[PDB]
Amino acid sequence: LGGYMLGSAMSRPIIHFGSDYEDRYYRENMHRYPNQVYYRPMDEYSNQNNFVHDCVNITIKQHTVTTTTKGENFTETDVKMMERVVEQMCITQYERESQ
Amino acid sequence: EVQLQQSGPELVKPGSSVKISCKASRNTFTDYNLDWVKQSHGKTLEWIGNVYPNNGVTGYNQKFRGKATLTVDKSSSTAYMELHSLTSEDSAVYYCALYYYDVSYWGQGTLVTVSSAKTTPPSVYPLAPGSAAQTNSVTLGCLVKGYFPEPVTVTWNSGSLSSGVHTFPAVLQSDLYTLSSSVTVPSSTWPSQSVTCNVAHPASSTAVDKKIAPA
Amino acid sequence: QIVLTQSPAIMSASPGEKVTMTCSASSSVSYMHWYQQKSGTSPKRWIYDTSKLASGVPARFSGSGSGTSYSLTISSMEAEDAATYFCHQWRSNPYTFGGGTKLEIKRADAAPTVSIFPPSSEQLTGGGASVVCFLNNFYPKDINVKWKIDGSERQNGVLNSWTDQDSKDSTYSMSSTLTLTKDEYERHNSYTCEATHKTSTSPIVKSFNRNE
């Protein structure tokens, strides 16, 4: 949390992967994934992609260094699938930030 | 590659509960999805619920909440369905279904009977022709009578007789199961090479061997 | 609760025929799956993700569709394919199954091999007396048995059981059992199994006396 903003809650988007197993998987596991992003402020960024990249890395770390505190565990597919949904949310957050 | 075995057939008194099992054998898939599916009277399939064993997530069909509880145990790659508070409606074949991407494996099914009926081992009766036969092949068979519950499984020569075997569905009649099995052999092998039907009843632990001698 | 409706419910096809079965959904689904079930065995995925064939499924099969309309096609109908096929969806809890299409192959007509059997010594000493009759490897499935105990007809105490279409020779089979009591059995002498079919002009008869 040293230097970050935390965005408000957003409805988790649906991600499609091109297999029914993956779609089904995500849809049943999505409650375990973030619904708010951590990010660094707008004005540190030259462009929206650099913003999104970081926002993904940071959120993912903060969510996993707090779920493992609970007692939770994530498969390597979960983090694949988290990267996907956190990307969309971060894109939404950049969008809120500029409007 | 992966084997899915499910526990043997249960007989439960109404109002009781039962826990059937299902284990991924030679599974290398870290995660994967286990579906539980019920099939009544040999046709309609209904999804019960599922678990992703490694680790946690459980999903239910609304219809089956309070009826089925689903859990897992990776101290032994085994999944469990507790069926709660059983009625005759709960009598069915319950399937185990592993999904991991392209790969799919369904277990062999666990047959639950919900009854009070006593567990009678079947009489096994050999069936041999009368004073004459022979056209080109000759026909024998076993009658498996007065047992409960289902299933039983018939094998001819312990499985080494597969050509021309017909084992028929059981019919319940006055609270008892009866089935029959025919096997057709070439004219010139019987009675010269010994022929036997092997009847197993996993519920009364009887494995019976009956030879067929000419009457 | 996406409702899958399959059609037709039952469907007989001649060999080598193109065969199409449908599965219609109440709400839009993204992928459809198909399972095959032969009597005895458990269902087995046959097509997954709408169009991809499960392992060991023959290439003459294909699936297509989108939205609410999905199909399964055998490009060339073959005896092993005789089975019941169900569609399945993973779009929303509860995942639901189709009502199943039962698919049968047509073949050249064939008569039953009728056989009849006395009760055994184990049985008679047990207390019962069950006379058995196997009607085997016939086509088409429509058949009927009659039991004669010295010429008269019987129904109560007769058990009948049928198999589905064989995946090798495409035939149906049946067993009928006349159950009596050692008292009622030994009262009478001559026993007759009596099968009516398309193949024969006359009800096929198998019989025995009490000698062997």
Side-chain angles (χ1 to χ4, degrees), chain A, chain B residues 1-117 119-130 132-215, chain C:
Chain A
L1 213 135
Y4 307 94
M5 288 172 74
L6 172 78
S8 53
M10 72 192 78
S11 55
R12 274 182 224 90
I14 298 300
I15 278 70
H16 294 283
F17 306 83
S19 77
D20 215 7
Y21 178 84
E22 280 167 288
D23 298 7
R24 193 183 162 184
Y25 187 98
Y26 170 85
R27 205 186 50 236
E28 297 189 274
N29 292 255
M30 90 203 281
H31 59 123
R32 299 166 64 245
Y33 306 147
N35 70 317
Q36 49 197 328
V37 295
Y38 291 86
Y39 55 105
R40 321 209 85 239
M42 271 300 112
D43 57 353
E44 293 180 356
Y45 293 107
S46 275
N47 49 281
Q48 102 135 51
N49 307 90
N50 280 187
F51 173 90
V52 175
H53 189 236
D54 270 343
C55 169
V56 177
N57 298 339
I58 298 156
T59 312
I60 247 81
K61 225 72 186 299
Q62 284 297 140
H63 193 53
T64 50
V65 305
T66 68
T67 42
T68 51
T69 316
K70 304 166 180 276
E72 188 93 329
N73 79 342
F74 289 117
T75 43
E76 188 98 71
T77 270
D78 286 315
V79 47
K80 163 266 208 105
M81 227 152 264
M82 262 189 286
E83 280 165 1
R84 218 87 102 70
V85 78
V86 178
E87 212 206 351
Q88 292 331 298
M89 300 183 292
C90 289
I91 294 170
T92 314
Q93 187 68 16
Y94 184 81
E95 267 163 30
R96 269 153 169 186
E97 285 296 321
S98 38
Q99 221 73 78
Chain B
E1 163 64 52
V2 194
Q3 198 87 119
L4 268 210
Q5 201 134 48
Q6 307 177 58
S7 49
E10 308 293 324
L11 174 46
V12 214
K13 271 88 266 165
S16 279
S17 78
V18 83
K19 190 177 264 156
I20 66 182
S21 68
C22 171
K23 71 129 66 177
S25 6
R26 297 107 200 285
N27 165 60
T28 76
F29 311 131
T30 338
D31 68 64
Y32 61 85
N33 186 218
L34 262 152
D35 272 350
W36 291 92
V37 180
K38 159 190 172 143
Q39 195 187 32
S40 314
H41 55 266
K43 72 175 296 100
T44 57
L45 304 149
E46 294 157 290
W47 174 80
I48 302 175
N50 76 306
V51 269
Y52 297 86
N54 170 74
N55 182 4
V57 204
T58 309
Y60 293 95
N61 191 316
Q62 195 160 311
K63 191 180 189 288
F64 288 95
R65 295 192 160 277
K67 172 58 60 191
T69 300
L70 299 183
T71 53
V72 80
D73 174 15
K74 14 112 127 197
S75 283
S76 62
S77 319
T78 311
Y80 294 97
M81 172 160 70
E82 180 171 25
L83 293 168
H84 300 275
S85 208
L86 273 85
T87 80
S88 46
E89 282 294 304
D90 300 315
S91 316
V93 179
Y94 292 92
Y95 290 106
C96 205
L98 142 73
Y99 299 99
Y100 178 80
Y101 293 69
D102 349 78
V103 343
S104 183
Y105 290 96
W106 281 53
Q108 78 270 66
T110 289
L111 191 120
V112 176
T113 302
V114 188
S115 190
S116 315
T119 305
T120 313
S123 296
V124 167
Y125 300 141
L127 306 164
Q134 90 156 325
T135 45
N136 65 298
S137 268
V138 94
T139 319
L140 302 164
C142 265
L143 171 71
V144 187
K145 184 177 169 54
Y147 76 84
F148 196 81
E150 271 261 69
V152 302
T153 36
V154 189
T155 29
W156 288 95
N157 296 344
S158 309
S160 290
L161 255 264
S162 186
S163 338
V165 176
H166 302 268
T167 303
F168 297 83
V171 270
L172 196 66
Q173 192 203 16
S174 263
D175 216 21
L176 285 154
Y177 278 110
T178 308
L179 78 57
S180 60
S181 187
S182 92
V183 58
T184 296
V185 297
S187 282
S188 42
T189 94
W190 190 79
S192 75
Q193 284 276 150
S194 321
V195 171
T196 323
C197 85
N198 307 188
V199 177
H201 192 243
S204 82
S205 298
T206 34
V208 200
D209 275 340
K210 215 76 202 185
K211 193 178 179 162
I212 323 292
Chain C
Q1 324 65 339
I2 293 151
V3 175
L4 297 181
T5 320
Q6 278 180 256
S7 65
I10 168 153
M11 189 177 94
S12 141
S14 314
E17 266 201 32
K18 181 166 190 164
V19 160
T20 343
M21 57 193 67
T22 314
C23 170
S24 162
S26 66
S27 351
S28 337
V29 301
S30 271
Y31 306 94
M32 185 76 65
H33 307 271
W34 303 78
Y35 298 62
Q36 169 185 99
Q37 203 193 15
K38 281 154 184 258
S39 63
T41 69
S42 88
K44 167 202 290 287
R45 203 164 63 173
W46 212 241
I47 294 188
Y48 64 97
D49 284 9
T50 299
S51 78
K52 310 187 192 267
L53 313 181
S55 87
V57 174
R60 64 190 171 270
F61 280 86
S62 83
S64 65
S66 69
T68 37
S69 308
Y70 291 80
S71 82
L72 164 62
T73 304
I74 314 172
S75 66
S76 174
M77 174 66 187
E78 234 72 78
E80 323 95 63
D81 304 335
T84 318
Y85 299 74
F86 301 98
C87 50
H88 185 217
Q89 61 78 213
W90 290 353
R91 175 62 170 259
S92 70
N93 194 318
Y95 314 116
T96 43
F97 284 95
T101 294
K102 185 180 229 168
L103 165 66
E104 295 170 313
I105 204 151
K106 278 162 168 283
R107 52 149 289 126
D109 311 336
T113 300
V114 183
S115 320
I116 197 177
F117 305 84
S120 59
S121 72
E122 268 89 20
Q123 169 144 44
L124 295 163
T125 328
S130 295
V131 173
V132 180
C133 188
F134 296 121
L135 280 47
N136 278 339
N137 300 53
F138 58 93
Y139 183 103
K141 44 189 166 164
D142 325 75
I143 206 156
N144 200 344
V145 212
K146 195 172 90 180
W147 284 92
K148 294 196 168 197
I149 311 163
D150 279 302
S152 279
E153 192 196 22
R154 210 92 169 307
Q155 285 180 55
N156 216 17
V158 154
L159 285 182
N160 298 127
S161 189
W162 308 262
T163 42
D164 285 328
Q165 192 164 53
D166 194 85
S167 32
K168 207 156 136 57
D169 67 16
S170 312
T171 57
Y172 300 89
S173 280
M174 196 220 220
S175 98
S176 183
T177 309
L178 178 69
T179 305
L180 316 178
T181 55
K182 187 191 180 286
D183 273 60
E184 199 193 6
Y185 170 71
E186 292 202 50
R187 270 186 266 160
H188 305 264
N189 161 69
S190 196
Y191 300 78
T192 298
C193 185
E194 208 151 331
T196 301
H197 197 253
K198 176 221 272 277
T199 51
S200 66
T201 168
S202 315
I204 313 141
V205 162
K206 273 279 189 199
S207 303
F208 65 91
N209 305 20
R210 203 127 52 96
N211 311 130
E212 264 81 13

